[PDB]
């Protein structure tokens, strides 16, 4: 008829057998949620930087 309702027993042991892992950050994170005005201008800024570097390196 009636059974157990809930328990967190053994759940931390399960979670730690394959460890609790960190999200593995990167250089250059994704511009998700970054302000559209900011990243719209950032595109043109990077484009100009690349063009000037190419001109300087001939």
């Amino acid at each position: 008829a009636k059974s157990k309702n809930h328990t967190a027993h053994n759940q931390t042991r399960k979670a730690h057998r394959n460890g609790i892992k960190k999200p593995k950050t990167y250089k250059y994170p994704s511009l998700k949620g970054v302000d559209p005005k900011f990243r719209r201008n950032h595109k043109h800024a990077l484009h100009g930087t690349a063009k000037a570097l190419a001109a300087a390196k001939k």
């Binding site: 979670a15 394959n18 609790i20 892992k21 960190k22 999200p23 998700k32 949620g33 970054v34 302000d35």
Partner: protein, 159 residues
């Protein structure tokens, strides 16, 4: 039935401090947050907009976005057996700079200055911090400090 609304179990955690109610002082709004700044999250109960969920009270994260009246914060949340990245749009009333990171930044400046002086004289300037060491030998003088002998005291009722 059970109840798991957005602000459930926040009765005391979203209190204002005792005799610290009312208008937020302007230092909160005069603060400047940059992407990469590390901030603490503490919800102000009098500003109901841009308010964090109760899980993030006391969490410390990194600013990833700056808007008109808010900052985006990355927070690592443990879900199951791994950590997930969470992005929070929080009004500046609910955050503050991390004093730990402040002191780390001046520790970086002090380290650079010690290295610059050690380049002149005193190489190997021991930049790394060390734990508290065991104490060295010492002479303790009895002159004017004759030891006083103590003993346990008998039991008394006090009533």
């Amino acid at each position: 039935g059970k109840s798991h609304g957005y602000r459930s179990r926040t009765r005391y955690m979203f209190q204002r401090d005792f005799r610290k109610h009312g208008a937020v002082h302007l230092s909160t709004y005069l603060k400047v947050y940059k992407v990469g700044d590390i901030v603490d999250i503490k919800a102000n109960g009098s500003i109901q907009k841009g308010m964090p969920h109760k899980f993030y009270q006391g969490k410390t994260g990194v600013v990833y976005n700056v808007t008109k009246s808010s900052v985006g914060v990355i927070i690592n949340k443990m879900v199951g057996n791994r950590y997930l990245e969470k992005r929070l749009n929080l009004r500046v009333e609910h955050i503050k700079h991390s004093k730990c990171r402040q002191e780390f930044l001046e520790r970086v400046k002090a380290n650079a200055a010690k290295r610059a002086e050690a380049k002149a004289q005193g190489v190997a300037v021991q930049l790394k911090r060390q734990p508290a060491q065991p104490r060295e030998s010492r002479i303790v003088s009895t002159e004017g400090n004759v030891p006083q002998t103590l003993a346990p005291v008998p039991y008394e009722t006090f009533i």
